[PDB]
C-alpha cells in the first residue's frame, strides 16, 4: 500500500474506532494488504502488541445507486449477527470486523457436515426480510444486462476474437429465451438470495473446527437480492465443479464430475428444508419425498442460469477486469457445462 493511503487508513481508524484507536499515533499503526484488485480491496489494520484495550479490523476500499443498498444490507446483517460487525462507513469504503478464519477450499463443499451447514445458513439467509425490491427481476435483468454488453464487445487480440466468435456462435439471445421458457415453467419461491455462494465466500471460523453445525459464516453479499431460491442452490451446486486456487493459467480448474450426485444433492436439501420451513420436519414421509424430488428438478434447472449468467459475466470481465484470470476460458467452461447440463436434463 502506497504510503499516502497508509495515511487515510490511519485516520479512518483513528476517527472511527473506539478505545485505544482514539489515542493512537501514526508511528504505531500496522496495516498489511489482504487482497488488491483495484476494486473492493481488503486490508488488515491492527494495533502493536504493546497496546492494551478490538485489536484487528478489516478495511474495505470500494475502488470503482447500488452503494446505498450494499451499505444498508451490510449494516442490517451486522445488526442481526449474520455478518461481520460494521465499525465505520465512509465514501471510499468501510471498516468491518475481522473474522479470524480461512476461506473454504472447493473440495470441502462436499464434506457432509460442511454441506449441511451451508444449507442451514443459506436457509437462514433466505428467511431474512430485507428492505429491497421483492420482485425477482435480478436474474433475467442481469443476464440481459450482460448479454447486451457481450454483443457490443470488440477485442483487439486475435485469440480473444476467436474465443468470442465461438461463444457468439451459440446464438446467445435465442438461447436466453430458451432458458426463459424453461425457467418461467419451473416454479421457485422468491427469497433473499446470496447469489454467489462459493467456497471463497464461506469462512471457516477459527477454533470452531470441532463444531459440527456452527463453524461457518457466509460473507460477501455484493450480488445479494430477491431472486428465485433455485438460483442460490443451483449456483452453489455448480461451484462444486470450480476451483479458483489453481496457480497456473487460466487460474481455475473445472471438473464436471465433481457436480453433486443425487445423494449429495438430497443431503444438502434435506438440511436446507427444515431450516427454511420450520414445520417441514412434521410432514409425511411420502410428502417429504415429493417435495424433495420437485426440489431436485427446480435446483438443477436454475443451475443452467448460473452457467449462463456467469458465462456472460466472464466475457465482460475479460474486457474490463484488472485481475489476472482466464475469463474467456472460464466463460467457455460455463457454456460447456450449460450444454452438458441441458443434455443431462433432457431440456
Evaluate whether 214 touches 117 at the Cβ level (below 8 Å).
yes
Please work out the total of residues on this chain that contact Mg ion, with binding judged by CB under 5 A.
4
Q: Quote the least distance from Cβ 212 to ligand U6E, whole Å.
A: 21
Q: Which does 242 bind (CB under 5 to 8 A by kind): Mg ion, ligand U6E, none?
A: Mg ion
**Is the Cβ of residue 39 or residue 255 nearer to Mg ion in the bound state?**
255
C-alpha closest to that of 219 among 17, 12, 58: 58
Q: Which does 239 bind (CB under 5 to 8 A by kind): ligand U6E, Mg ion, none?
A: Mg ion
196 binds Mg ion (CB under 5 A): no
SS3 readout for 252-273:
CEECHHHCCCHHHHHHHHHHHH
Binding residue for ligand U6E (CB under 6 A) from 5, 46, 51, 101? Answer: 101
Per-residue x/- mask for ligand U6E, residues 186 to 225, rule CB under 6 A? -----------------x---------------xx-----
Cα gap 283→102, rounded to integer Å: 38
Any binding-site annotation on 309? no
102 binds ligand U6E (CB under 6 A): yes
Please work out the total of residues on this chain that contact ligand U6E, with binding judged by CB under 6 A.
16
Evaluate whether 15 touches 59 at the Cβ level (below 8 Å).
no
DSSP H helices in 80-203: 112-127, 138-152, 158-168, 172-184
State whether residue 43 is helix, strand or coil.
strand
58 binds ligand U6E (CB under 6 A): yes
Any binding-site annotation on 103? yes
C-alpha closest to that of 121 among 175, 197, 184: 197
Cα gap 81→148, rounded to integer Å: 38
239 binds Mg ion (CB under 5 A): yes
Q: Which residues are annotated as a binding site?
A: 35-41, 60, 97-103, 198, 220
Q: Which residues are annotated as a binding site for ATP?
A: 35-41, 60, 97-103, 198, 220
Amino acid at each position: 500500500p502506497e504510503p499516502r493511503t497508509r495515511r487515510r487508513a490511519y485516520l479512518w481508524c483513528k476517527e472511527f474506532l473506539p478505545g485505544a484507536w482514539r489515542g493512537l499515533r501514526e508511528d504505531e499503526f500496522h496495516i498489511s494488504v489482504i487482497r488488491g484488485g483495484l476494486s473492493n480491496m481488503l486490508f488488515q489494520c491492527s494495533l502493536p502488541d504493546t497496546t492494551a484495550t478490538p485489536r484487528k479490523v478489516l478495511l474495505r476500499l470500494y475502488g470503482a445507486e447500488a452503494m446505498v443498498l450494499e451499505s444498508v444490507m451490510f449494516a442490517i446483517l451486522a445488526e442481526r449477527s449474520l455478518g461481520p460487525k460494521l465499525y465505520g462507513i465512509f465514501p471510499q469504503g468501510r471498516l468491518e470486523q475481522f473474522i479470524p478464519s480461512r476461506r473454504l477450499d472447493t473440495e470441502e463443499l462436499s464434506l457432509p457436515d460442511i454441506s449441511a451447514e451451508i444449507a442451514e445458513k443459506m436457509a437462514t439467509f433466505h428467511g431474512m426480510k430485507m428492505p429491497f425490491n421483492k420482485e425477482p427481476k435480478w436474474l433475467f435483468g442481469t443476464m440481459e444486462k450482460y448479454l447486451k454488453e457481450v454483443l457490443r464487445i470488440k477485442f483487439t487480440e486475435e485469440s480473444r476474437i476467436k474465443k468470442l466468435h465461438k461463444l457468439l456462435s451459440y446464438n446467445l439471445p435465442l438461447e436466453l429465451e430458451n432458458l426463459r421458457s424453461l425457467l418461467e415453467s419451473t416454479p421457485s419461491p422468491v427469497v433473499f438470495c446470496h447469489n454467489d455462494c462459493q467456497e471463497g465466500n464461506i469462512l471457516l471460523l477459527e477454533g470452531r473446527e470441532n463444531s459440527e453445525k456452527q463453524k461457518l459464516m457466509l460473507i460477501d453479499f455484493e450480488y445479494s437480492s430477491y431472486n428465485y431460491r433455485g438460483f442460490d442452490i443451483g449456483n452453489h451446486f455448480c461451484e462444486w465443479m470450480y476451483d479458483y486456487s489453481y496457480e497456473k493459467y487460466p487460474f481455475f480448474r473445472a471438473n464436471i464430475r465433481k457436480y453433486p450426485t443425487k445423494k449429495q444433492q438430497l443431503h444438502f436439501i434435506s438440511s436446507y428444508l427444515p431450516a427454511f420451513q420450520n414445520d417441514f420436519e412434521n410432514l409425511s414421509t411420502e410428502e417429504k419425498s415429493i417435495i424433495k424430488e420437485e426440489m431436485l428438478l427446480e435446483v438443477n434447472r436454475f443451475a443452467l442460469a448460473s452457467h449462463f449468467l456467469w458465462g456472460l459475466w466472464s466475457i465482460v470481465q475479460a474486457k474490463i477486469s484488472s485481475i489476472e484470470f482466464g475469463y474467456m476460458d472460464y466463460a467457455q467452461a460455463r457454456f460447456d457445462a450449460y450444454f452438458h447440463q441441458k443434455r443431462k436434463l433432457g431440456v
